């Protein structure tokens, strides 16, 4: 029996695995008392993970495209050695012609947990700043906002909270089951629960207060709560006095958001919003667990800022409710391995997005350099995901060659075609590449567009030392269950082999991933054989707020309720809510043709993002891409529940199976993210196995009107109008 960090989704429950006599790997909830993962924390995605590891369609060998047009499905198996030789040769030619900045990378490291900083190390040595990640609108953006406010991304304590505030978070036995169990434990301790969700979910039913707000309006709801907490003086006067700046300015701002106005905006009742605010401030320690919905709105910046402000002012950073992370105290920081200082300033300045949405770039984050050196001993603190190219800028440079060409593109555990907005432009960008490399487990829609598809190992085939989002104040060890199948290799193998061919061997002394793991843990004096024997290693953290506290990694050293960085960048230093530019409020005329407010998302028990749609048990649990309409709404449109429809915005459309569902509020429509059809032939004739027909990014604009102005991420949750009609 092994303890393994499940990487079938990103919450990373620790499970137990065992190889049975017939070679099948059985996974189950950990039978021992685990320090972080509560009992009975395993879901169908994990239970059935071996059906993916052993799937007949898994790519186990390097494939070279031998067609005459990108996207043509004509593939020939080659060796790793030959693939790497050819990739390096072509990349050298591309870089000689277009500069190292012409290499773009989309990487989801949480899916791989294998490179330990060596990916950005490689890019920084080559001279490319053009790294991005689908986490540009999930956690990575949030960390930027947290950093300008209080220097580091915060973590909410389910164990210590006496009040939890949920934004969406449709937790269940198959959506972040460990956290589902954490919540249940909390409730039984007497912890109160406040749920903001237009959909009455199971967590909404469990809630002490359920606020059925209108899609997209969380920022307004939170401003209303801050109004109540400031005006009622329910805040922690000592923390505000000693550790915050800009409180008087914040106080003035929230007078713009009285409960009568917020009630009108949100569709919630004023008295309920007040109860929520009061409960949150008085039922300490009170936390707001990170939630995706507010990373995906036109008002995302303000909604995130407002959450940070709420936690700060009620005392959550000093009562155990919210913890400010750091590079792990026991380990060599990933940030240091990444060698951001090696990338020349000239190349940092070129990072795509610097000229449009600089906030999350090296340039936008630069005011945090000295503060980060001071507090964390790391000038370039790669907190969760950081120093990022803006995806719209990246795909636009790929597609148009402006402001300059990007001509090589690597997708590392990232179905990049489908992982952002404006999927048509991502396709155009990919079709204008001279080199595309896809490191994955399957012939995904993105891999279908590659010159080379390289087989990645699976989480049941690798050891892992955590944390692999730098900032998380603990790491769980993951044991290797089996050797990788076929010729699947680890992410560091790929990076090192390429680095050597690019002339960078001297900077990559670790001969394999195990040596790199041993380097990551080297300050402990242990090697991996000994290290893996303990489940969890907690990090020490700086003394932020004690009597001789060091404060936070912000320009002022204090919690910036009024953000100096935003002021600097020309953005509103304080949170606000403006109606998205495509709603029934901002555009009632457009709403005559497009009567539905759009929500793209709603995670499904049996799949993770675009993963696990291959024929099998998981696909069978939810086999079609499904639209959800309230029965009354569907009825009005003449669409029988269970019939195929198009859902169309001003940007584009996708095809879905209408299922009527009374929990979906009237006049709103759900579309899924990540849906495609791996059973189909690939290539453009099938829209890349249905990608072009069934993915939400087909209908999501990334014009400026649909971008968060400060972060440059796309709005997905409210703020967009749609129509639905029969196929
Ligand atoms: N339009 C839109 N975009 C979104 C979202 C949305 O709802 N809508 N969701 C956003 C959010 S919240 C997140 S967190 C991100 C998620 O983004 P990702 O986690 O990147 O998810 P996918 O886009 O499905 O691409 C993941 C790819 O990783 C491959 N893979 C899985 N495990 C491994 C492995 O061990 N090794 C290798 N080499 N490959 C592996 C899968 O086969 C898959 O092709 O997407 C974001 N992007
Ligand atoms: N099975 C499975 N589990 C997963 C994932 C998966 O793909 N599959 N993905 C994981 C990842 S990467 C993420 S980011 C999380 C996301 O986890 P969740 O937050 O659970 O995200 P969803 O399931 O997309 O939507 C949950 C609720 O958010 C609500 N919602 C939508 N828009 C808004 C809004 O504007 N305001 C408010 N208050 N609520 C809104 C919806 O009505 C829905 O009920 O799930 C994780 N867990
Ligand atoms: S929620 Fe399920 S898929 Fe995600 S880490 Fe936990 S067991 Fe794995
Ligand atoms: Na051209
Ligand atoms: W996510």
Label this structure with key terms.
binds ligand MGD, binds iron/sulfur cluster, seven-stranded mixed β-sheet, tungstoprotein, globular, lyase, DMSO reductase family, binds sodium ion, monomer, Dimethylsulfoxide Reductase, domain 2, alpha/beta, N-terminal domain of TfIIb, binds tungsten ion
Helix content: 25-40%
What distance separates the N and C termini? 51 Å
Structural class: alpha/beta
Trace the largest sheet across and list its strands: 5-4-17-16-15-6-7
- The fraction of residues assigned to DSSP E strands is 15-25%
Main sheet characteristics: 7 strands, mixed
Number of distinct beta strands: 26
* Ligand species: ligand MGD, iron/sulfur cluster, sodium ion, tungsten ion
In the CATH classification, which architecture of the largest domain applies? Answer: 3-Layer(aba) Sandwich
The total number of structural domains is 4
CATH topology call of the largest domain: Rossmann fold
Question: Rg to the nearest angstrom?
Answer: 24 Å
CATH level 1 name of the largest domain: Alpha Beta
Q: Which outline best applies?
A: globular
- Total helical segments: 27
Active site: 10
InterPro entries: Acetylene_hydratase (IPR041930), Asp_de-COase-like_dom_sf (IPR009010), MopB_CT_Acetylene-hydratase (IPR037949), MoPterin_dinucl-bd_dom (IPR006657), Mopterin_OxRdtase (IPR006656), Prok_Mopterin_Oxidored (IPR050612)
EC number: 4.2.1.112
Function: Catalyzes the hydration of acetylene to form acetaldehyde. Ethylene cannot act as a substrate.
